[PDB]
From a paper:
Here, we present a workflow that utilizes the SPT Labtech chameleon – a next-generation nanospray cryoEM grid preparation device – in an aerobic environment to freeze O2-sensitive proteins under functionally anaerobic conditions, which we term (an)aerobic. Demonstrating the utility of this workflow, we determined high-resolution cryoEM structures of deoxygenated human hemoglobin (Hb) in various liganded states and the molybdenum-iron protein (MoFeP) – the O2-sensitive catalytic component of Azotobacter vinelandii nitrogenase – in a reduced state. Our workflow maintains (an)aerobic samples by protecting against or eliminating O2 contamination prior to loading into the chameleon, during sample aspiration, and throughout sample deposition on self-wicking EM grids, respectively. Finally, we detail the effects of O2 contamination at different stages of the workflow and show how to prevent their effects. Together, we demonstrate reproducible high-resolution structure determination of O2-sensitive proteins of varying complexity and size – as small as 64 kDa – with a workflow requiring only minimal modifications to a robust, widely available EM grid freezing method.
As monitored by UV-Vis spectroscopy, metHb has a Soret maximum at 405 nm, indicating that the heme iron is in an oxidized state (Fe3+) and incapable of binding O2. To eliminate these possibilities, we next assessed the effect of the protective oil layer on grid preparation and downstream cryoEM imaging and data processing using our metHb sample. Briefly, we created two metHb samples – one without and one with the protective oil layer – by placing 15 µL of metHb (~ 125 µM) each into two sample cups. One sample was used without modification (non-oiled), and ~ 70 µL of aerobic Al’s oil was carefully layered over the second sample up to the brim of the sample cup (oiled). We did not observe any noticeable differences neither in the quality of the sample stripes on the grids nor in their behavior during data collection. A comparison of our 2.78-Å resolution non-oiled and 2.71-Å resolution oiled metHb EM densities did not indicate any notable differences in their overall quality. Indeed, the view distribution and the total number of particles were similar between the samples, each resolved to a similar resolution and demonstrated similar map-to-model validation metrics. D, E Comparison of metHb densities determined with or without the protective Al’s oil layer detailing no obvious differences in the metHb densities between the sample with oil present or not. Thus, the addition of Al’s oil to protect the sample during chameleon grid preparation does not significantly hinder the operation of the chameleon nor our ability to obtain high-resolution structures.
Residue numbers in the entry:
A (entry chain C), C (entry chain A): 1 to 140
B (entry chain D), D (entry chain B): 1 to 143
Write the structure that this text describes.
């Protein structure tokens, strides 16, 4: 469960992320693939090399989904229903991989926004990403 | 922990540029803030209510220094982590009753702190090498 | 996130549990203490022997809390605000212990209600106990 | 895994009354139902949509029989679990890419299945002995 303070923290952090969302998501996906190779088994049709156009496009899609989730934080299960159906019913992704991707997103945000990554913002983003992972993994 | 020679060289070069006194304290404080149930083990450190009070705690800073010293000792003995972290594993399991997942949590927080400090220098390959290092360290403490 | 199907399954299962809730909770606590001794550190003032009145009373309290959570399944986050305050801010319990207690409750229900413990009911109760644990571990 | 003589006697006595074909498939099917992300590994089995289809699958029953055979082999070698499950650990870690948490989940599901089958005689001491047995088995597979 998210508090209003952490909700405001996440909103401000992703608002200042802004237009670099696609690059940040692509870098997070690249970090996940490099440091947790078992996550590569979910993308057997993808080109998982550095600078891949497929990885860049998927990172842009993930970043857009995260922006939508931020804009609809109070109704996440109803805003991420399509992604929940995709990840839970069709892809059947292990939630451990969601944890790994959330950590890689946190690492990317820390590396690209040193000033905004205060401990409070780090905790708020951790809780926000945990909530997002919960909805996508759950089937309802 | 098995690392390539290039990965080991990269890990060591970043580690030399690491400010131990700040990095260990920041990692411990960020762990205590992001995962508040970990303050049960550190209630003896004084005021840990707000994040600013957690990060401004000399006891937290000193304990983070000790933790990062243990991390450096493990880094110097990457081939004997299990034997190096035997006393610490006994202390954390038999006497402190720390769940093994908290070791992985602290390792991830340390990786995030390193990324925060180094920025572009924390490339994805360096992060992968450090992830292998911290996963090996966490397992040795869990043993 | 729970669905109407597993919500109804949990409601029916707890209705079948009925008045044996106190003894079921006491037995679940005894199982958790016996099989996961690290959970005993959260009760240093308790007498944790077999057949203890303190453990019986705490099991009754836990069972009543679970009953009210079932009764307020759609509004659990604010229906369990006092318990979230107690466990998250004051006691600071590791969510691993909540996982262990949920497993022990599932084992107790399996042992005491064989016919009612179908795989669907098992999955429904697992998901319901995961959500109750998340509300009581979340800090808002 | 270190067990007391009483715990070993209770574990063996309870396992003597286990029906190998029924309990194994039931545990595997309950795993596939309660944790639906585990059907990604068993898509080749066929229809796994409804709980009744998961629990009425001959391939699921046969694989549960194999899993319980492995569990019995581990029980017969409680002092050599790491060496007993070396080939299975290699198979699950390299060729199947199964997360180590799923081993703990399957062990807990098996404990729930044993409680379901035995009822009152699945006492808390017997459950504790089986809990540490399945914990040791899962730790061997994760290795
Ligand atoms: C916060 C976490 C995540 C978010 C916001 C997210 C978001 C998305 C989005 C927006 C898509 C595009 C769907 C489409 O274009 O049809 C997608 C697809 C997909 N996701 Fe995720 N995802 C997350 C986590 C994960 C993880 C951790 C994995 C695997 C380890 C994963 C595996 C996939 C796969 C395989 C696809 C299919 C893409 C394709 O086939 O081109 N997702 N996800
Ligand atoms: C990679 C992970 C970890 C490492 C390398 C590590 C290392 C250390 C070191 C070097 C000490 C000092 C021992 C001494 O001075 O004799 C220590 C003590 C301690 N550790 Fe850790 N630790 C880790 C994880 C954790 C975590 C995650 C927690 C809690 C959630 C924890 C709780 C404690 C406590 C409470 C003490 C004693 C502090 C005191 O008594 O003031 N440890 N650890
Ligand atoms: C999983 C579902 C749980 C429920 C429904 C629950 C519910 C409750 C209730 C109703 C109380 C009494 C509140 C009062 O007396 O004012 C309580 C107290 C307490 N709970 Fe829980 N609890 C759960 C999990 C846990 C777990 C897993 C632990 C520790 C491993 C724990 C540790 C405690 C402690 C230490 C107390 C204080 C007892 C006392 O002061 O006498 N709880 N809980
Ligand atoms: C936790 C204790 C476990 C035991 C004792 C066990 C035992 C076994 C054994 C003996 C085999 C050999 C089957 C054969 O050679 O045909 C096997 C294969 C397999 N296991 Fe496990 N297993 C465990 C956990 C898991 C879990 C949790 C999963 C998935 C979530 C899994 C996925 C598989 C798969 C996909 C196969 C191959 C099946 C096939 O090729 O038809 N295992 N396991």
């Amino acid at each position: 469960v998210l508090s209003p303070a952490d909700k405001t923290n996440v909103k401000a952090a992703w608002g200042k992320v802004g237009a670099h969302a696609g690059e940040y998501g692509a870098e997070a996906l690249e970090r996940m693939f490099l440091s947790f190779p078992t996550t590569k088994t979910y993308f057997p049709h993808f080109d998982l090399s550095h600078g891949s156009a497929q990885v860049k496009g998927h990172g842009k899609k993930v970043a857009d989904a995260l922006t939508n989730a931020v804009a609809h934080v109070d109704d996440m299960p109803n805003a991420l229903s399509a992604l929940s159906d995709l990840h839970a019913h069709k892809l059947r992704v292990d939630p451990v991989n969601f944890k790994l991707l959330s950590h890689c997103l946190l690492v990317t945000l820390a590396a690209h926004l040193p000033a905004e990554f205060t401990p409070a913002v780090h905790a708020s983003l951790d809780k926000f990403l945990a909530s997002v992972s919960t909805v996508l993994t759950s089937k309802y | 922990v098995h690392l390539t020679p290039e990965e080991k060289s990269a890990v060591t070069a970043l580690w030399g540029k690491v400010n131990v006194d700040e990095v260990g304290g920041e990692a411990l404080g960020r762990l205590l803030v992001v995962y508040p149930w970990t303050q049960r083990f550190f209630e003896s450190f004084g005021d840990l209510s707000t994040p600013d009070a957690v990060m401004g705690n000399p006891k937290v800073k000193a304990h983070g220094k000790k933790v990062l010293g243990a991390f450096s000792d493990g880094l110097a003995h990457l081939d004997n982590l299990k034997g190096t972290f035997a006393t610490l594993s006994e202390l954390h399991c038999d006497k402190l009753h720390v769940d093994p997942e908290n070791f992985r949590l602290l390792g991830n927080v340390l990786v995030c702190v390193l990324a925060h400090h180094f920025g572009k220098e924390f490339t994805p390959p360096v992060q992968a090498a450090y992830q292998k290092v911290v996963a090996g360290v966490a397992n040795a403490l869990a043993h």
